[PDB]
């Protein structure tokens, strides 16, 4: 596990009310949500390195990011 | 808001094997994360608006998750 769990229980409930206004979210439901999030971003922070390195750099930048997505087909 | 922060982020990156970072990253990261969620939740929403669940369950999440 890796980010303190108060938001996005805050940031989540924010967009959660942005879609179907009074949808509430069950205990343990949102639990799951963070677990995917981390694996996904770690899943991307490994990839975005690859950009950097094909570019033969090291401090990764937006460059690498946006790039990784348009290639995954995630644009944007 | 996107009030989530940078040390969480460096911890993340290195686990991804990131060796170094730029500062720009940190906002970019929040911004894209956003897109991730509000994607998947608008998707996970439905499985529960479809199953007519009041408060949204975990099982419908994995479904929203079987999808890219």
């Amino acid at each position: 596990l890796l980010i303190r769990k108060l938001p996005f229980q805050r940031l989540v409930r924010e967009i959660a009310q942005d879609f179907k206004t009074d949808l509430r979210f069950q205990s343990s439901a949102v639990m799951a949500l963070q677990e995917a999030s981390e694996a996904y971003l770690v899943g991307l922070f490994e990839d975005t390195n690859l950009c950097a390195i094909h570019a033969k750099r090291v401090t990764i930048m937006p460059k690498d990011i946006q790039l990784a997505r348009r290639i995954r087909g995630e644009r944007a | 808001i996107q009030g989530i922060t940078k040390p969480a982020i460096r911890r993340l990156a290195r686990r991804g094997g990131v060796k170094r970072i730029s500062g720009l990253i940190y906002e970019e990261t929040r911004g894209v994360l956003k897109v991730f969620l509000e994607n998947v939740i608008r998707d996970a929403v439905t499985y529960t608006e479809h199953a007519k669940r009041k408060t949204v369950t975990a099982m419908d999440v994995v479904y929203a998750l079987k999808r890219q």
Partner: peptide, 23 residues
Amino acid sequence: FIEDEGEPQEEMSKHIREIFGYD
């Protein structure tokens, strides 16, 4: 008659980790 060898609890995030595959 042993074993269907298996133990874990909330290994419904074991499954999570594996559709992203990590470690």
